[PDB]
């Protein structure tokens, strides 16, 4: 299973800030390391094989993990879908993805519900 490294996660965040907006130069590598650490830990602890459950984890962990003061929701969605793309699953934009990410950040949508939504959209 291909994953995203802490240094890749920061690079993604930085790259998104540059393209779409936000305050640059602030990304904490400890938060990147801590976000990835959670995702790996959860996988090992629950023995997760389902790509969409893992994808959901990157999304929730990142959206609530505050790598920096801005762009966290974008970095969450993008890292989720990058993971899917890296593991062979074809991804594409959908009107649902904005609400989905906001819900994960606010706590209104659980990790499993995110995994369900992502499965419906990109599953086979």
């Amino acid at each position: 299973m291909r994953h995203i490294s802490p240094e890749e996660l920061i690079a993604l965040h930085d790259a998104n800030i540059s393209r779409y907006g936000g305050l640059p130069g602030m990304s904490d590598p400890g938060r990147a390391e801590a976000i990835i650490g959670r995702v790996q830990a959860r996988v090992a602890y629950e023995e997760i094989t389902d790509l969409f459950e893992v994808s959901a984890t990157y999304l929730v962990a990142t959206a609530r993990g505050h790598i920096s003061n801005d762009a966290n929701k974008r970095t969450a969605l993008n890292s989720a879908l990058l993971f899917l793309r890296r593991n062979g699953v074809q991804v594409f934009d959908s009107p649902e993805l904005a609400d989905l990410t906001v819900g994960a950040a606010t706590g209104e949508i659980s990790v499993s519900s995110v995994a369900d939504t992502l499965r419906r959209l990109y599953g086979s």
Partner: protein, 72 residues
């Protein structure tokens, strides 16, 4: 540029100084597919460019939702 894994074994310290100077050395094996030794500095820079392109097409694919999330 191209050498067999035996000439590498005996002359590894030469390969290092070559690699560090700026060379990119291939390492072949008969019957198998080859590898490449290069400086960590240049390898990492190449990897990073690969990664930039990787983000750029994802951002392209999700351009619409990315723009929308900025305002929320």
């Amino acid at each position: 540029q191209s050498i067999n894994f035996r000439t590498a074994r005996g002359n590894l310290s030469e390969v290092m100084n070559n690699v560090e100077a700026g060379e990119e050395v291939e390492i072949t094996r008969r019957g198998r597919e080859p590898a490449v030794i290069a400086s960590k500095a240049t390898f990492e820079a190449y990897k990073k460019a690969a990664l930039d392109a990787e983000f750029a097409s994802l951002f392209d694919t999700l351009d619409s939702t990315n723009k929308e999330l900025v305002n929320r």
